[PDB]
Amino acid sequence: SVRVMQLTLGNSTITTQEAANSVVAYGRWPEYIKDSEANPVDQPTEPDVAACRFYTLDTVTWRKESRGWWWKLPDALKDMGLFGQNMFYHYLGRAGYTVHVQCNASKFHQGALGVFAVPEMCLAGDSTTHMFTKYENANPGEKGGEFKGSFTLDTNATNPARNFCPVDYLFGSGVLAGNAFVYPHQIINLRTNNCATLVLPYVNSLSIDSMTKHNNWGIAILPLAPLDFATESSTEIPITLTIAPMCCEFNGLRNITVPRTQ
Amino acid sequence: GLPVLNTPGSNQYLTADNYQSPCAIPEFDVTPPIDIPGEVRNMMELAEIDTMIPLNLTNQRKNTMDMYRVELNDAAHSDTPILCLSLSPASDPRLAHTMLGEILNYYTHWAGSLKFTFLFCGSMMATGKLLVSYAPPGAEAPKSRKEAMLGTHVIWDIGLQSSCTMVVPWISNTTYRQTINDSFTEGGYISMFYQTRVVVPLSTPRKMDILGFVSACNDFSVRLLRDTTHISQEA
Amino acid sequence: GLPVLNTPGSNQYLTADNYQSPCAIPEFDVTPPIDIPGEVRNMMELAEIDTMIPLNLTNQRKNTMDMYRVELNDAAHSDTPILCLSLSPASDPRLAHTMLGEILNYYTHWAGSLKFTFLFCGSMMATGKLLVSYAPPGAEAPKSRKEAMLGTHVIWDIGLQSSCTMVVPWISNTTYRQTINDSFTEGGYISMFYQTRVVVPLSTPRKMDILGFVSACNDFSVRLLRDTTHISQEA
Amino acid sequence: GLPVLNTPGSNQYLTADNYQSPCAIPEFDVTPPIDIPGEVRNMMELAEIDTMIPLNLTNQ
Amino acid sequence: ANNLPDTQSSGPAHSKETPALTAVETGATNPLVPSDTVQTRHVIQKRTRSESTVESFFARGACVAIIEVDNDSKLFSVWKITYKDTVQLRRKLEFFTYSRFDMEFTFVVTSNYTDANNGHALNQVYQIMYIPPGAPIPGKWNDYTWQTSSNPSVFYTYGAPPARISVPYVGIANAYSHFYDGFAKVPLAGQASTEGDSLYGAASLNDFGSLAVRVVNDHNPTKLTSKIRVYMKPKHVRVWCPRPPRAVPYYGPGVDYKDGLAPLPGKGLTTY
Amino acid sequence: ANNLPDTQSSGPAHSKETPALTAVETGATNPLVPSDTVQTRHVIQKRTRSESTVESFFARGACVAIIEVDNDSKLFSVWKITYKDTVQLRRKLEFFTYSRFDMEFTFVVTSNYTDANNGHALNQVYQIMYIPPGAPIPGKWNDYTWQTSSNPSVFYTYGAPPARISVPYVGIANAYSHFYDGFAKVPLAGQASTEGDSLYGAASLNDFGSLAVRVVNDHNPTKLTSKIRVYMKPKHVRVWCPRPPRAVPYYGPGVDYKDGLAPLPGKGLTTY
Amino acid sequence: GAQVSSQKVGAHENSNRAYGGSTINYTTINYYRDSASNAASKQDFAQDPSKFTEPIKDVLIKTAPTLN
Amino acid sequence: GAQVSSQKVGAHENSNRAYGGSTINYTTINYYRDSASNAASKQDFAQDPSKFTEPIKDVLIKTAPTLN
Amino acid sequence: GAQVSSQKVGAHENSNRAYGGSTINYTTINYYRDSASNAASKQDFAQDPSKFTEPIKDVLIKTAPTLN
Ligand SMILES: COc1ccc(OCc2ccc(COc3c(Cl)cccc3Cl)cc2)c(Cl)c1
Ligand SMILES: COc1ccc(OCc2ccc(COc3c(Cl)cccc3Cl)cc2)c(Cl)c1
User: Fold this and answer.
1) CA-E129 nearest atom, ligand 2
2) Ligand 1, from F109, F164, F208, F210: best to mutate by most atoms within 8 Å of Cβ?
3) Atom of ligand 2 nearest to the CA of E64
4) C16 within 8 A of E59, measured Cβ to Cβ
5) Contact yes or no for F202/A131 (Cβ under 8 A)
6) How far, in Å, CA of F162 to CA of F232, rounded?
7) This protein's superkingdom (chain A)?
8) Total of domains in chain C
């Protein structure tokens, strides 16, 4: 039925008994580069089962006060097994994804989470200096980031944070959040479903790019209807994020990249 | 040479003309296209996607995530409206900033049917019946369920299918309406009432939110491209 | 490029030209037409509809409803005219403001036949015979029935058919006449006389009105569009 | 004459245009060509010839 | 736009058919021709009604507005689009109740030094921007609105032949209404008198929007004034329901009158 | 750019099919039409979406720059090519993530005497030279760079109709990116913080090069200023991935915001 | 896409060209996509005035009595 | 090398030329070698919004229950 | 005397005219007698660089030893 599914990729399987169908972004399933759209001339590496499998990133907790969370792809998976290895050993890389967000509660809980997949999800910074966010802050990895309820300008001139300041109702980029529904999405309304499943093809203005310099997709999760339970002002339910890269192919092998951190 | 006669309009520059001109970079090897997902052919495609409506523009809620949440409760049945709206998709503050309203503000005329979808975000243990209504212009705006029920309406029963859609049919005198607040091309009123009441058992939240969405139907069209007031530039 | 040579008349603006120009609102979705009753194709269609003539322009009657009423009475037979008019449809004060005269004032030339219809508004008990006449220009304007009877005339017998039409045939030297008072293109005289007399029995009104109407025949045409003097604008 | 309408761009001089113009020396008897060795059709032909690289740019 | 019928010869009559007699009470006009009441000869008719067709009657550029700008807020002007600012075209259009056509607009631009012996300026360029009802109206001769990314603009260089553009049938109804016997609002029972009140005979508060005109050059202290005379010509014309023409002076956008109520002169009943 | 479907008549219903009920959690929009929830009549639809096609939406010349030159280094100016110097066209382009089109550039040139009663100059000729990233940039209004043996130049004579040229799709990628979630450099472990640092969302330091404008005439002591307004129109348009439009004021080339963060007005929940 | 119509010659020159041939025809070509840009053809038709001159239900003959 | 397309006539003149013939067609000829120099034809197609409106894996009918 | 060539369309409009018909062709006509007055056609051919890259008397294969 629309509600029961099983996803198998490599050596990993995911089962769900409360789905609300699955979304295939823009109606496009991920695919490899065709010869007619090929650019780099060298033989690509395609790890296949070693990289195209389900990786579970860290679990976040939803509370009445949560504003939202965000992650960047392939960034969030840079340290994930052999996918991360191939990402750092190659100059160029390409991949699609199957994003599976998990969140179960009970029949006496309420709340709705909007799960959006955004191509080129550029976020707003914290200073008066334009495009000032530094690489280390823009790429948090598997832990991702969070949305805020208001904009707060960083004034420390001696030691600028050079970080993002994504305000939730402004979708972290100066647009109204209610219009974010034009992007592939699903809603995890506690009275209806457990999860959200989105299949994302590779989207870019090029056939292949640098995975370290460029993040193709952004995953934004916003509480559309806040978490509430029985009478417990105190309520916490975890949100686990499991993502699997698809049709990975890398070009331009050399020595490994070791990016600067923190 | 060939005898010619210059007609009025010569040497002018019409910002909306469509002529040919010499290429400044001749014989340029243009990069071929690739099949990028999500291509768009018409702006109306975007107007047909559900976009969340900022229904709660009260002073404490406007410009926060709370402007999108309309709260309901398990109180005894009342005939007073849960919300009220005017069918002015491009000008009503609650509709003017949705994806639909944003596009309508780049055009002078609009025509067609619209649909409002409401999502119930209460717990699974909560039940209830609501009446969503649409009253064509010309009479007093409905203030009780009794008046609202006399116009176009959908009685929504809450359950498994979490959402309910009410189609606002194209009922107009003129062939196209204007994207500004104008009485001559006024559209009517949208309102919601409790049919019975929201009922929840013990150990369950007594207040919950509903979210509203708006999109255009397949018979919707706009015309006369104009500039929007939604973007400005000082100095 | 292609060698061209600019001829005199280039870059001018002829108010009556007929050229193409770029469209300022391209790809506009034009509202289709509906079949509205009463469409007009030619201005001459309007000139062929009977319009009431303001025959009585005396100081007390002009610019009142009385300017349209010409009164008759049961007096003994007289050879003096009931009314007199000049065939200058665009300039005679009595004809210049009828629908026919209004249209003629937007043109410089007119040609064709005209017809005058008179309606008897006396009681049913009233009887009488009248002589309506038309005298082509060139001789003395008729002042007695004896002179009028020598030209084109219709002897109207009053009865069941309340009205009578007299056709003023196109009798002209020039192929077209001017819409201004000019002797070279003068049209002649229209007059009415009592043939016998209006007779009424006792207990019946001895005075009654007749109304006149004027319209163009099917061989009527106008040419050379010009501006009318019937509308002005100060400052 | 034939009614025309001047479009924007008229009377300008685009350094990269490609139009016709009158010949200032009409009916000139042009010297015919001869088959000279080493003709070139494309600049890329020259880029495909090995050229020595100045690898040692040290001060001395 | 065609031919007229020939006159057929007609001889004497003595019959029971009387086309001269009629009854105008029916609401009809007696379709008589000369041969019905007099003896006629045969005339081969060559005159036509080619120039009185609805199209030829309106096929002239009429002035509808004179917009003025002083290049020393007057650095720019706004004209609410209408055909009622002038009287000549308005009176012709009002021979009919409804119309449907395309429009051709020609702009004649003139300028001059206010001072006979002072100031100087380089050739001026004008921008005529159409602001459809809803679009932002310029507050300054140089604010962001003049970017025209969507509004149609016409840039005219002084001295060039008059600018000219065509506009399609832009009505929101199936035809333009020259007369509207109604209101845009219906006052409801119970509401304050201030409520539900609107102008008689008015439709939208902003029917067709307006034109914003300005000189693009940087203004010099020199005293200069320019005037843009707008000429409009209806082309591809269709009209419905004829009406008697305006007899007394216009008094506003409505059918209101006040002043020249006695249009006809005096003339003796029996005076030729 | 076509037709809309007709409305089919629809009668009453009493069935197990309930199109009114749905579940938006799936991420889909309910494709209902009036006849799904009410009784409808048959209407033959004649309206079309001809003017809302991606092409017609952008088919307007929008101002992207106002370059100024003072013919008394200001004798020449350089403008780094971009669409972000203005807001109107930028906001429309940003409804999409990627685009691919040709460009038409029209140049409106105006000039004037700064002094109302002083100076005089003969008609000016302007040179608009395109300097592709890499070509030498002019240091003086008259140095060797203005020879343009390879760079495309446009020589405009003051008073002539606006100059206009077309540019092909010149991107180094298969489409123009309106948004780039990345950097041009990756800082490597071990290198100084000064190292490997670049702007967020920036690609090449010099994407499309710039325009160098100057007056070719020898400058006279007279005080004169000229302004070249650049208008650009995307033609032969294709766009990908729609995005919600900009709601708050722009704050630079990025998606940064700072000032008008509260765009919506107050309105009662139960107020019509 | 040229439209060739004939003119209604008023004043005739002492030529046979004034009476026949392409010399009494005129040529037209539309340059714009929008019909609004077009000029007026002026080959306009006429109609019956009856809707105004005789909007009578029961049709009557002029020779015959109107009031019957 | 002329391209002859037909116009979508909005307002119709009282002519038969407003309904047929080359009088409702427009002619086009490209003068430049580079396609960039060309004007926009504006004979643009539309498409299915489904990729945005219903990017669902398992296709669903509106009459049928969405959550099954 | 018109020469009709086809253009190499770079950016394609959402039209079928962008893919076929006279809409992707351009027309040319020479107005001057002297060929010098003509514009450049720009339909220019290429050639083998061998005269520069391999002006060798005894032809050699890259796989095979150059010095034999
Ligand atoms: C996504 O939106 C975009 C993408 C690219 C853009 O600019 C690319 C660009 C590249 C070169 C030139 C050079 O054009 C010119 C030439 Cl050859 C000669 C003379 C004048 C000009 Cl003006 C102009 C623009 C713009 Cl403005 C918007
Ligand atoms: C019944 O008689 C009528 C009906 C409508 C009329 O006006 C309608 C109308 C609507 C838009 C525009 C806008 O036209 C323009 C454009 Cl796009 C660009 C530049 C200049 C102009 Cl000018 C102009 C007129 C008039 Cl004047 C008479």
Assistant:
1) 19
2) F208
3) 26
4) yes
5) yes
6) 13
7) Viruses
8) 1
3-state secondary structure of E147: helix
CB–CB of F1 and H44 under 8 A? yes
Residue A218's contacts (CB-CB under 8 Å, 6 or more residues apart) are A70, A71, A72, A73, A117, A118, A119, A120, A121, A123, F181
Residue E209: how many CB atoms within 10 A of its CB? 21
Alpha carbon distance E68, C35 (integer Å): 41
Q: Which residues does ligand 2 sit against, CB inside 6 Å?
A: C 24-25; E 64, 81, 83, 93, 99, 103, 105, 128, 130, 152, 154, 165, 167, 170, 176, 208, 211, 232
Within 10 angstroms of residue B37's Cβ, the number of other Cβ atoms is: 22
How many Cα atoms within 13 Å fall on the side-chain side of residue B219?
Answer: 24
Strands C39-40 and C207-216 come out as: unpaired
Per DSSP, the residues of F113-154 read: ESSSSS---PPPEEEEEEE-BTBPPPSSTTSGGGG-SSS-EE
| Elucidated via | X-ray
Residue C74 structure tokens: 């049961």
Give residue B223's Cα distance to chain centre.
16
Q: Which residues pair with A21 in a beta bridge?
A: none
The whole-angstrom distance between B9's CA and the closest CA on chain F is 11
Locus of tokens 């609102």: C25
Contact map slice: H 22-61 vs F, CB within 8 A: 32, 34-40, 42-46, 52-56, 60
- Which SS3 state, helix, strand or coil, does residue H23 take? helix
Radius of gyration of chain I (CA): 22
Q: How many CA atoms lie within 13 A of A147 on its CB side?
A: 26
The structure tokens 């780049």 sit at B106
Tokens of F266: 């107050």
- Domain annotation for chain A: domains and CATH numbers: 1-262 (2.60.120.20)
Q: What is the CATH number of the domain that holds B215?
A: 2.60.120.20
| Structural domains of chain H, ranges and CATH numbers in brackets | 1-68 (4.10.80.10)
- Give the integer Cα–Cα distance in Å for A178 and B53: 7
Q: What are φ and ψ of residue A245, in 5° steps?
A: -70, 150
Shortest Cα distance from H42 to chain C (angstroms)? 8
CATH number of F1-272: 2.60.120.20
Q: Which amino acid is at B57?
A: L
Ligand 2 centroid, distance to E82 Cα (angstroms): 8
In short, whether F231's Cβ falls inside 6 Å of ligand 1 is: no
The domain ranges of chain F are 1-272
Resolution of the PDB structure in angstroms? 2.9
State the Cα–Cα distance between residues F23 and F257, nearest whole angstrom: 35
Chains interfacing with A (3 or more CB pairs < 8 Å): B, F, H
Going by their DSSP bridges, the two strands A23-24 and A195-200 should be labelled as: parallel
Which range of residues forms the domain containing residue C206? 1-235
Neighbours of A89 (CB within 10 A): 16
